[PDB]
């Protein structure tokens, strides 16, 4: 539960760091954002579940 | 090895952060050094 | 303080506030890269 929580919360940070540097260069070079429109979509969708994970999971640790 | 190769905009943002770092070290030194008050 | 669990992020949260400033800054990294057009 706890480590399970620190995992979700900690991974959620690295995804953000990655997501943040990503989306930019994404819409940036139109070398796609069609193939990456797939990547970004998964990052975005993923992110939300994660927040919801840490959200609900918070009430069990603290 | 001359002629611009190291893109300028990078020489700057690098030499730039480099100054905020040293000048920032000074600001930290203000709450620890001898110039402290503690 | 930060709820017991998140404590591991204490340090992280210590720098978050300053980020906004960075953006005003970046806009300059950019223009420099794009040769002040």
């Amino acid at each position: 539960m706890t480590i399970l929580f620190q995992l979700a919360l900690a991974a959620l940070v690295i995804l953000s760091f990655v997501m943040v540097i990503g989306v930019p260069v994404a819409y940036a070079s139109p070398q796609d954002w069609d193939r990456s429109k797939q990547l970004i979509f998964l990052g975005s969708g993923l992110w939300i579940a994660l927040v919801l994970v840490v959200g609900v999971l918070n009430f069990f640790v603290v | 090895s001359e002629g611009g190769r190291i893109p300028l905009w990078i020489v700057a943002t690098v030499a730039g952060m480099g100054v905020i770092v040293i000048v920032g070290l000074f600001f930290y030194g203000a709450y620890a050094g001898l110039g402290s008050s503690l | 303080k930060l709820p017991e669990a998140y404590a591991i992020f204490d340090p992280l949260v210590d720098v978050l506030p300053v980020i906004p400033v960075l953006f005003l800054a970046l806009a300059f990294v950019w223009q420099a890269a794009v040769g002040f057009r």
Partner: peptide, 28 residues
């Protein structure tokens, strides 16, 4: 103790997201 580790990365991050663009040359 030394969360300067943090700053450092999120710091070279800003310039990175434009540099990679200088490489993939496009949209700056």
């Amino acid at each position: 103790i030394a969360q300067l580790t943090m700053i450092a990365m999120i710091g070279i991050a800003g310039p990175m997201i434009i540099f990679l663009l200088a490489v993939r040359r496009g949209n700056l």
